[PDB]
Amino acid sequence: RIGGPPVFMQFPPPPPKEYLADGTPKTYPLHQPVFDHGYTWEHWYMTNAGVFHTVYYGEFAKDFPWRWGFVAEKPFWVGAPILVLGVLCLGHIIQTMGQIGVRPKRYTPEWVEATKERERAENT
């Protein structure tokens, strides 16, 4: 349809490049940090690249913060079991901080015996 929204248009050329006064190319913000740590592992994974192709995807330690570089360096079945227990222990610790020294009377031996008497009478 003459004068309608074009099906295809070519991109205009990009705006002029900016140099610094000394000739250094002007750099712009980039959120791709080079984290500082001693880990240098490189993990590669065969990945689906459609139906008939694959791609060898690599993860580099320097692309990740220290915490992940440390964890991802160890064997999974060395870390995983320790982490599982640790998280569970921490949860219990957190839930015990608010009840330190709490001693309800219904958990004393005297109350425990009285319930046994009630159960005997009621054949519970």
């Binding site: 870390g79 982490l83 998280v87 569970l88 921490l90 949860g91 839930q95 309800p104």
Partner: protein, 459 residues
């Protein structure tokens, strides 16, 4: 611009973003519940403020269902890929798509504002009268939120139905999943609106439908006539995602595509006629109970066919491909988890078994395994599959075996013990309980704190 944008893909991102935000409030409420239930006594809620707990459980349920999982699986992933799957330039109704997300946000603000300003009382997310109609103004505010949410849901359903008129390719299984959910919404929402209006009439217009000589059981019929179709409006989009992920990642064409599609249609029709399995203990007639029990058990047939068709998709796939991707793990975990939830659903479907297990934490664990585990994981798996297309970053999820393992283990620590206390028995919607149920409640509570900690490791 930000709020003015009509781009269907941008709006899809907004839906996911808002679901995570509102989700933070949802998870916080869940932590309050589990903390309280850690032992017997009062832990974080005073005995004089027990009304707050009733409000916490009510808002938890409502927010997670209508403001988090539904906006995420029926608004987020659908608005981003459906027009692409349909090889169409954009969504049929651009302006309607914009207002729908704005409506969801505005209804969320109303709800949370009502927490802050109104007296905090609760009546469950099922808003049973007469309790719902003898409450304070916070109930009125919640009703406004639901009605407003209903407007967004119906207009979004209209939007997806119009794709049939413009689709330029083949209706894939996922597209069929959304269309049928849209049909379920168009047929169920108008009934919900009517019963909600009657709740308002009794709250605000001196109506007498829910006082003596008026049957309160009437509400439960009309509510659950929408209620159960809602649980399938929340699961069917998840099924559609699972089909795409398994076929794509395993490089295998969907097996029994037409049976998958006809299974989704069947689940919808059946799901529209089985609502009274939520009303087994009211005292319905013997023949009604037998009809509903019979038809409820039938839903397993079409649901079972889909499960087995998924299994053969993963079977036989090439070994060279790395299988530790988070999206693939979540998709597989869904099959393993959904079977647990569904089987327990069949158990509760037997009404005589249900007499013992109604209003107990067995029901909780049942719908958590499907929603809190299955639906959440399906939404995560779908977003993860579209990470390159969506383009988000600054998270460590795509390849994180620790996150998947820890999540699976700890989520089961929360809800598996809730099946046990269902035969103990521990009623639902309670905060205090007998001292002999502490062990299992404590174990589940330890599971809840742990799951939250694992949510921090993704960043």
């Amino acid at each position: 611009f930000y709020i003015l944008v009509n781009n269907n893909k941008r709006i899809g991102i907004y839906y996911i973003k808002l679901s995570i935000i509102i989700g933070i409030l949802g998870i916080v409420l869940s932590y309050i519940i589990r903390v309280e239930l850690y032992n017997s006594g009062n832990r974080i809620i005073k005995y004089d403020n027990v009304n707050y707990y009733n409000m916490v459980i009510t808002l938890h349920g409502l927010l997670m269902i209508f403001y988090i999982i539904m906006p995420g699986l029926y608004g987020g992933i659908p608005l981003y890929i459906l027009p692409i799957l349909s090889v169409i330039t954009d969504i049929v109704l651009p302006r309607i798509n914009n207002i729908s997300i704005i409506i969801v946000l505005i209804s969320y603000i109303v709800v949370i504002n009502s927490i802050v300003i109104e007296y905090n009382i609760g009546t469950g997310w099922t808003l049973y009268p007469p309790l719902s109609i003898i409450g304070t103004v916070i109930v009125n505010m919640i009703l406004y939120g639901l009605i407003i949410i209903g407007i967004s849901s119906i207009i979004s359903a209209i939007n997806f139905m119009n794709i049939l008129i413009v689709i330029d390719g083949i209706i894939y299984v996922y597209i069929w999943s959304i269309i049928i959910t849209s049909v379920l919404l168009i047929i169920s929402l108008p009934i919900l609106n009517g019963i909600l209006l009657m709740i308002l009439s009794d709250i605000y217009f001196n109506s007498i439908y829910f006082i003596l000589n008026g049957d309160v059981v009437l509400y439960q019929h009309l509510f659950w006539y929408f209620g159960h179709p809602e649980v399938y409006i929340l699961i069917l989009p998840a099924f559609g995602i699972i089909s795409i992920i398994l076929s794509v990642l395993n490089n295998k064409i969907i097996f029994g595509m037409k049976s998958m599609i006809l299974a989704i249609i069947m689940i919808s029709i059946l799901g529209s006629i089985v609502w009274a399995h939520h009303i087994y203990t009211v005292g319905l007639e013997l023949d009604t109970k037998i009809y509903f029990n019979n038809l409820t058990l039938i839903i397993s047939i079409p649901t079972g066919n889909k499960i087995y068709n998924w299994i053969i998709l993963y079977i036989g796939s090439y070994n060279i491909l790395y299988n530790g991707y988070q999206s693939l793990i979540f998709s597989i975990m869904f099959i393993i988890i959904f079977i647990i939830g569904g089987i327990t659903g069949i158990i509760i479907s037997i009404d005589i078994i249900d007499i013992g297990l109604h209003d107990t934490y067995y029901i909780v664990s049942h719908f958590h395994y499907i929603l809190s585990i299955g639906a959440v994981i399906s939404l995560l798996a779908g977003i993860l599959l579209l990470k390159d297309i969506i383009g988000y970053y600054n998270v460590i999820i795509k390849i994180n075996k620790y996150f998947g393992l820890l999540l699976f283990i700890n989520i089961n620590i929360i809800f598996t013990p809730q099946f046990i206390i269902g035969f103990n028995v521990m009623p639902r919607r309670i905060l205090e309980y007998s001292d002999n149920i502490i062990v299992w409640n404590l174990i589940s509570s330890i599971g809840s704190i742990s799951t939250i900690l694992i949510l921090l490791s993704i960043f």
